[PDB]
């Protein structure tokens, strides 16, 4: 099971993508833990899948951000409800498909980028990163093998899809 390889640890994907997204917004995330392995080709592919996902729903991401900012005290709980819902959203395939994985990291990276534009929100960036990583980590553990999904297959499909938008 390639998703069990320390090189492919979910934390790595989240940190890399979040860092990448923030930079795309003209900023330098100087509080991002390091990549104890360096950038991997799979992270490279995630950056693309995430970019394509965002562009496809740029308007909605903006509206989602606005609705989250409307919650009293701008609590982190509603964001967990978002994440949890995506994971528990029914299907006859993997509860944590490549699509949901990508959607969660793409939306999470977008939110991270916006939150960094506000000092008042920067503290909660640790929550965002940690929670997103731990949630996805658990769901892959109890879903990928059964529904025969893997990073190799992910890469196989990702390349072909990156080509269509290229």
């Amino acid at each position: 099971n390639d998703w069990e390889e320390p090189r492919l640890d979910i934390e790595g994907f989240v940190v890399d993508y979040f860092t990448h997204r923030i930079r795309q917004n003209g900023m330098e995330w100087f509080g991002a833990p390091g990549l104890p392995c360096g950038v991997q080709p799979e992270h490279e592919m995630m950056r693309v899948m995430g970019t394509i996902f965002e562009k496809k729903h740029a308007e909605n991401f903006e509206t989602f951000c606005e609705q989250l900012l409307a919650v009293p005290r701008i609590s982190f709980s509603p964001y967990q409800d978002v994440v949890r819902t995506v994971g528990n959203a029914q299907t006859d395939q993997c509860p944590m498909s490549y699509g949901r994985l990508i959607g969660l990291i793409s939306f999470g990276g977008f939110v991270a980028a916006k939150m960094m534009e506000s000092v008042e929100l920067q503290g909660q960036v640790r929550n965002l990163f940690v929670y997103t990583s731990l949630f996805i980590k658990t769901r892959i553990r109890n879903n990928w093998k059964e529904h025969n999904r893997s990073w190799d297959d992910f890469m196989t499909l990702g390349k072909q899809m990156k080509e269509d938008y290229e």
Binding site: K56, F64, P78, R84, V86, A89, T91, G99, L104
Partner: peptide, 27 residues
Amino acid sequence: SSIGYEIGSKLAAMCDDFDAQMMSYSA
């Protein structure tokens, strides 16, 4: 909340469409 569920449901739908598009690649 109820806002998180709403957003979560739409993001779930967007994600499922993305996945379907990806699955159309065993070609």
